[PDB]
Each structure stands twice: as structure tokens, then as C-alpha cells.
Design a protein around this nucleic acid. Structure first.
Ligand SMILES: Nc1ccn([C@@H]2O[C@H](COP(=O)(O)OP(=O)(O)OP(=O)(O)O)[C@@H](O)[C@H]2O)c(=O)n1
Length: 367
RNA sequence: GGCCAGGUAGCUCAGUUGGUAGAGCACUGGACUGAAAAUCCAGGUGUCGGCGGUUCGAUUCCGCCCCUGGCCAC
């Protein structure tokens, strides 16, 4: 209905950005970004009015948001910078060629993909390429983004883009960039399933050294990351109903050798979940003694007592040890699964003493 | 949209190793009164946001959502 309203208003609207990319990548999303020549606000208001839904105008930004079903629609007036601006000017201010394309929703040309910079080719050639040499200097945050994209889509940086990125990092522009944008970029990164490769790119171009203070790369951490990769694979395979956020575990592995102050401060800046902070504070101190206790474990009930109160993250961190692996697994798919019939429990019940007795019965069954 | 709190009676507020819930003023009833209030005995003072899951058992552990306030990314 967008093309119709755009025709009535004598306007030109286009689908724009990553939304197009995901479309060309076959990935359907519920968030659509529009660029409108002419007023986007009135377009959004009219579209929201016809479908009879609420509208959220932003006059100063020149954009408007409206939700139809599960579809989240954003209309944005064309602008040459972050006189009426052409679509091309609105596209050229963006980051990479694959994010620089557009698809026309106007009824006459409808279905047409508009690519000025050859983003279609780079998408076809699996290439992450900047629109202009000054791109990374304009927005240093993009330094992460590229890598992140190169992580997700398994693309490669062009020689140009790569040299420009290295030059950008060497200038220390990563420190000059706003802390919030970078931290948010990392938060976006860890949510990726391919985020490990993104970390490989972070190590390769050494951006984490700039972002995180006191952080350095070694082999033990990397091997820990790949071991954690395997553990995450298995856990998300068999136990997949129990899944949690995995990237935070990698993030914990990275900052493990860091001081507790810088770690707590970083997790503070990252707005990490509570279980993440707890798992970290537990890892830095009590984890060692916990492992030493698991080594002294003989009966299965001791393993129970030492494990069951812990979160899943702590267990997945305990699976990093070769000797404790099969033990953790044994606790997972077997040990903690059991029950009791009616009459027996009725005899068990005849306060906290009921719980103690039940514990005695469990340790009676195990061993 | 991300996160941090906050969600406890009508209102204003505390509560951790999961194990049988609390204060200050309104609420009912009776004793009291010509009526009423005060006051005494007392006792409602609550599925401690909503829905699932784990657990013998969840205000607590976790997950998905509702609401309010604040940091932001917008
Ligand atoms: N410094 C920046 C940041 C963003 N952009 C452009 O603005 C858009 C911001 O939308 P975003 O959601 O960040 O990009 P997506 O490809 O949609 O990524 P995702 O779908 O993962 O959100 C991007 O497409 C990018 O082309 C840019 O030109 N310069």
C-alpha cells in the first residue's frame, strides 16, 4: 500500500540498507527501513491511518515509526548528511556497498533494485568494501562493524578497505570514538553465532587492545575460546532447550586474565546480565577452589551438592577441564534426573527436616 | 530497542543459606453509645506483577511477557 500512497502524494519511497541486504541474502526481517524523497512523516501518518494503527512521529529527526502486525516500519526523509536530498546522497553517507543499496516500492518501477556503488557485485563476491577512503575516519565505530559483518556473512575485506581500516586503528581513532557506540557494537557482536570469527578479526586487527584497557592476546585464552566453542556446540546440541546467551561466556574467557577492577568496570559499561556478573565474580575467585573440590570428589552426592546450586554458565566453564568434562556430563544427562512414587513419599513425610531426610534418601539412592 | 533498579495490604515501606510472612493509618463484627467517635478484645489486613519450566515444594532459580522510573543507543 506504500507505493499507492506514495503515488497519491507524488513521492518516491525506497527500501534501504541492511534490510535490502538481508532480502538479497534471503533472510526475512520484521524491521523495514524506508527512505522517502519528500516528507516521510506524512507518509507514515497516512499509512498508519489507513491501517488504523498508532504512529510515532519524530519531526526533528525527520523520521517516523509505525507497527503493523509483526512488521516494524521506519520512514526516514532523505538526507545528504548525518535543499532536498536525492536518494543517492542518502545512500552514499552509509558504511559499506552491501548496505548502500535500495529497492523501489514505487508502483511504476516496483521491484527494482537500485545499486549505485556496485554493492550487488561485492555481495556476490563476498566483499566488505567502503564507499570512500575517509569512511573509517568519519565513523571509527565502523571499524568494528565491518569485522562484525565479515564475521557474520563470512565475507572478506577488500585490500583498499583493509588498508584503510589498519590505518584508522593505527591513528588511535578507536580511542577518540564515543565509548557507548563501541560498547554497543561489541554487544551486537557477542549476539552473533559466528561471533568467534569476529573475535578472530578483533585479534587480527588488534582493536580490543584499543577498546579494552590492559587486554592482551595469548594462546591459552584462544584455545579456551575454541574449547568453549566445542562445549557450546554440544550443549546447544543435546541440551538446546536449556540454552542461554553463549557470547557472554566468550567475553568472560577474554577478560579472565584481566584485573578484577577493569573486568567489573568493563562489565559495568557493557550492561551485562546479572548471571554474567555472578559467573565472573565466581570465576575469578571461588572457581579454583571449586575445581580442587571436584578433584577430591568420590561419591556422586558430593558432586551433586557442589554442582546443583550453580548456574549453567558455571558448569559450561567447568567443562573446559578435560578431567571434569565427563563428570559434568554425567551430572547433566543422568545424575540430577530422578523421582519417587506416592506411597513412599507419603511414608517419608510421616519443616526443613523433611528436606534433610529427602537429601539423605537421594544420597542413599546415588551411592 | 539494551540495561539497572523498583512491583509486598486501600496507601506509604523492610524481608536470601527454598521450609508454613510483617509495621504506621483505613475493613468487617461485637463489647461501649440516645446516635457517633475514641478506645479494648481482637482478628480480613496478601494466589508478595502475569504466564510456563526446574524442584517433593518457588516471593527466591531460570525463561517469556505486563507496568513504572531512570541511564542510554535512538
Ligand atoms: N556509521 C554508520 C552506521 C550505519 N550506517 C548505515 O545505517 C544503517 C544502520 O542500520 P543497521 O541496523 O545498523 O544496519 P543493518 O544492516 O540493518 O544491521 P542489522 O540488520 O544487524 O541491524 C546501516 O545499514 C548502514 O548502512 C552508516 O552508513 N554509517
Amino acid at each position: 500500500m506504500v507505493g499507492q500512497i506514495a503515488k497519491e502524494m507524488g513521492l518516491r519511497a525506497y527500501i534501504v540498507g541492511g534490510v535490502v541486504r538481508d532480502i538479497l541474502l534471503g533472510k526475512e526481517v520484521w524491521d523495514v527501513d524506508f527512505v522517502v524523497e519528500g516528507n516521510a512523516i506524512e507518509l507514515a501518518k497516512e499509512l498508519a491511518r489507513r491501517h488504523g494503527v498508532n504512529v510515532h512521529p519524530f519531526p526533528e529527526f525527520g523520521t517516523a515509526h509505525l507497527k503493523i502486525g509483526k512488521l516494524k516500519l521506519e520512514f526516514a526523509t532523505a538526507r545528504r548528511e548525518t535543499e532536498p536530498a536525492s536518494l543517492k546522497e542518502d545512500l552514499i553517507r552509509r558504511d559499506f556497498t552491501i548496505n548502500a543499496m535500495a529497492i523501489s516500492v514505487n508502483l511504476e518501477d516496483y521491484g527494482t533494485l537500485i545499486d549505485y556503488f556496485g554493492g550487488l557485485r561485492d555481495l556476490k563476491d563476498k566483499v566488505i568494501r567502503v564507499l570512500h577512503p575517509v569512511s573509517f575516519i568519519e565513523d571509527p565505530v565502523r571499524i568494528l562493524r565491518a569485522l562484525r559483518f565479515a564475521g557474520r556473512l563470512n565475507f572478506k575485506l577488500s585490500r583498499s578497505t583493509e588498508k584503510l581500516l589498519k590505518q584508522a586503528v593505527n591513528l588511535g581513532l578507536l580511542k577518540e570514538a564515543p565509548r557507548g557506540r563501541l560498547i554497543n557494537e561489541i554487544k551486537l557482536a557477542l549476539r552473533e553465532d559466528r561471533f568467534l570469527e569476529i573475535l578472530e578479526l578483533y585479534r587480527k586487527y588488534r582493536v580490543l587492545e584499543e577498546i579494552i584497557e590492559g587486554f592482551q592476546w595469548n594462546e591459552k585464552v584462544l584455545q579456551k575460546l575454541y574449547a568453549l566453542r566445542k562445549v557450546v556446540d554440544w550443549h546447544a546440541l543435546e541440551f538446546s532447550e536449556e540454552r542461554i546467551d553463549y557470547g557472554w561466556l566468550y567475553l568472560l574467557i577474554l577478560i579472565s586474565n584481566l584485573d578484577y577492577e577493569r573486568g567489573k568496570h568493563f562489565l559495568e559499561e557493557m550492561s551485562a546480565p546479572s548471571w554474567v556478573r555472578e559467573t565472573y565474580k565466581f570465576m575469578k575467585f571461588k572457581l579454583g577452589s571449586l575445581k580442587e573440590e571436584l578433584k577430591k570428589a568420590k561419591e556422586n552426592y558430593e558432586v551433586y551438592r557442589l554442582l546443583k546450586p550453580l548456574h549453567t554458565s558455571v558448569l559450561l566453564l567447568l567443562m573446559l577441564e578435560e578431567e571434569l568434562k565427563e563428570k559434568i556430563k554425567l551430572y547433566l544427562e543422568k545424575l540430577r534426573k530422578v523421582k519417587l512414587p506416592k506411597e513412599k513419599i507419603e511414608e517419608l513425610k510421616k519443616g526443613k527436616e523433611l528436606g534433610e531426610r529427602i537429601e539423605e534418601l537421594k544420597r542413599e539412592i546415588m551411592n
